Amino acid sequence: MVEFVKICGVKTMDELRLVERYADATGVVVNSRSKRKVPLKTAAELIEMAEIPIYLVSTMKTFPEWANAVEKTGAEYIQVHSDMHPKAVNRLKDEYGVSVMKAFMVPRESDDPAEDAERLLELIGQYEVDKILLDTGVGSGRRHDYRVSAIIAKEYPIVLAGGLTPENVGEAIRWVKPAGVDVSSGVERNGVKDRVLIEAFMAVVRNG
Numbered sequence: 255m256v257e258f259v260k261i262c263g264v265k266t267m268d269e270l271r272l273v274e275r276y277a278d279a280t281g282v283v284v285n286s287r288s289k290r291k292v293p294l295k296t297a298a299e300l301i302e303m304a305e306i307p308i309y310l311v312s313t314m315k316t317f318p319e320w321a322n323a324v325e326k327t328g329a330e331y332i333q334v335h336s337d338m339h340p341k342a343v344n345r346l347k348d349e350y351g352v353s354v355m356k357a358f359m360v361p362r363e364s365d366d367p368a369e370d371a372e373r374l375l376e377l378i379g380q381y382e383v384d385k386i387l388l389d390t391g392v393g394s395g396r397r398h399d400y401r402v403s404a405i406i407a408k409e410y411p412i413v414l415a416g417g418l419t420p421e422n423v424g425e426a427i428r429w430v431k432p433a434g435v436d437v438s439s440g441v442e443r444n445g446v447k448d449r450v451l452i453e454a455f456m457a458v459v460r461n462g
């Protein structure tokens with residue numbers, strides 16, 4: 255049983271209200287290399303009208319960048335998609351009172367997933383965050399990424415992310431057994447959050 259579902263990358267009020275009927279959390283992307291990027295003012299509006307937790311999602315690297323974006327948007331939740339220092343992560347929680355989900359890339363430095371898993375756990379232990387997101391990759395290495403993530407998921411209630419779709423999320427869940435899943439383009443139709451795709455995704459998460 256997955257307890258947490260996040261649909262990331264809402265760009266409009268229409269996409270937000272749709273996602274809110276299904277997801278435990280959503281996210282709005284700023285100051286990042288992303289098709290879902292919106293200006294800070296646009297993110298500030300979605301953050302104000304959201305009725306579920308909405309993450310300010312970004313690859314911003316430095317404290318002043320994050321601090322400016324938190325001041326301008328009023329974000330309560332942030333998703334740090336970068337290797338900003340745990341000390342800088344902690345400064346944001348104390349000085350702005352935000353909850354943090356930290357995203358980690360799944361390393362592919364060994365053919366044995368257990369060794370990539372050991373390296374990943376030592377990086378994760380360096381942070382004090384509400385939530386751990388594991389961002390899985392593509393191609394043939396994806397099966398390796400699931401094997402790594404499955405080891406991590408025994409130690410932390412991780413959120414599994416990366417290329418999830420209605421067609422493949424069932425295998426990802428019973429392979430990795432995460433506490434949560436995160437999906438973006440897998441529930442888009444021509445780049446718009448799509449109700450029928452979301453319902454197909456949720457059916458798998460709730461069924462088995």
Ligand SMILES: [Cl-]
Nearest residue numbers: 353354383384
């Ligand atoms: Cl936190």
Ligand code: NA
Nearest residue numbers: 293295296297
């Ligand atoms: Na705007």
